[PDB]
Each structure stands twice: as C-alpha cells, then as structure tokens.
C-alpha cells in the first residue's frame, strides 16, 4: 500500500471529500490537516474501546512525538479504505460539506468488514454448567470420579 501514514490517510479523506488533491487544483492546508489528524485519533480511540471494541492495529500517538502527522498508522492493508472513508465522513461537517452517498455506503461496508473477523473470533460457546453430569460413557470421568463438569 502507498497509504502508510496518518497524513496519508488524511490526504485520502480530503481527496474523497473534494477539499484537496489534484482532481481539483486545491492543496492541503496545514490547519486543515492537523484538525483531521485530531479527528482520526479520536475516531480510532473511540472504535478501539480499550481493546473491547474494534481491533485494527492502529498505533496511537504519544505526547512525546511532536507531530502526530508523519507516524505510521500501523493498520493492515485491508483496513485503510474503511478507516479513511469513515474519516472523510467524520470530518465533512467542518467544511459545512456532506459526504456523498457512495462514501457513506463504502464507510458502512468497510466498518462491518473491519469487525467481521473479530466477531467470528468472539463468537464462542460457554463451558458445560457446573450442575451437569459427565455421563457414564466418559470412561476416564467414571475412573477418576469426575461425575460432574467443572462449570464457568
């Protein structure tokens, strides 16, 4: 991927919106880039609810590093599109704009795809209730007197 930094994600989002890039002659302004980096950090910190939310590999900026821009985002190759489409949607209201329907649809699809594998992994089944016999077919259980399953 050629998108490897927070600034790269911001540039892609602004290009999607119609605020930067070369499809129009407009160029990226530093005051409009810092705000978008702030919004991206807030959005990913909200998605990653201390590890209990969406897992994407994003690397959070530290107060020591002066520009949060310039750091690698740390995402995988399959998260970039979702992340920067949702970023475009999030930062559209600043310019009194409105993300187009295609961008909204792609953002929804990307977020769902981002959480799909985590949802599959978190779909787990509980152990047998503590008040449940092991049965007399389980020969080892009948041997060491493991008549009931542990539980929890």
């Amino acid at each position: 991927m050629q998108i490897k930094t927070k600034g790269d994600l911001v540039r892609a989002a602004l290009r999607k919106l119609g605020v930067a890039s070369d499809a129009t002659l407009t160029d990226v302004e530093p005051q409009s880039m810092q705000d978008a980096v702030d919004d991206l950090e807030a959005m990913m910190a909200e998605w990653y609810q201390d590890g209990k939310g969406i897992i994407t590999g994003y690397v959070f900026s530290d107060d020591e590093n002066p520009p949060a821009e310039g750091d690698d985002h740390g995402l995988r190759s399959s998260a970039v599109s979702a992340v920067f489409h949702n970023l475009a949607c999030r930062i559209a209201p600043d310019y009194a704009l409105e993300a187009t329907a295609k961008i909204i649809a792609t953002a929804k699809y990307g977020k769902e795809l981002l959480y799909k594998q985590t949802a599959i992994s978190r779909a787990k089944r509980a152990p047998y209730p503590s008040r449940m016999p092991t049965g007399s077919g389980n020969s080892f259980a009948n041997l060491n007197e493991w008549h009931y399953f542990p539980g929890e």
Partner: protein
C-alpha cells in the same frame, strides 16, 4: 559402678550416680497442596498426588 581394693575403708564410702539422655521431636513434614475447582488437571491426579505424598 566404681570399685576399691583394701581392708579398712573409713570415709571411703562412695555415692550413687545415674546419668540420662533426652529424646525430643522436631517439626511436622507436610504435603500442603491446593485443588482448583474448575480444572481437569486438578480433578484427575488428586489421588496420585496423595500416593506420591505418602
């Protein structure tokens, strides 16, 4: 017992002495161990552990 040799033993009578020894005990030798509720490894082998402790 001691033993003298001679005929007159005025003021030579001895006394009696009987020494002794003492036997005591130290500290218990234990095999304190734990049994987690929800463990297959603890449900099994908690009798082999008793045998090994013996």
């Amino acid at each position: 017992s001691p033993t003298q040799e001679g005929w007159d033993l005025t003021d030579k009578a001895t006394g009696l002495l009987e020494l002794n020894v003492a036997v005591n005990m130290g500290e218990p030798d234990n095999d304190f161990f734990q049994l987690r509720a929800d463990d297959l490894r603890d449900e099994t082998a908690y009798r082999r552990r008793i045998q090994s402790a013996a």
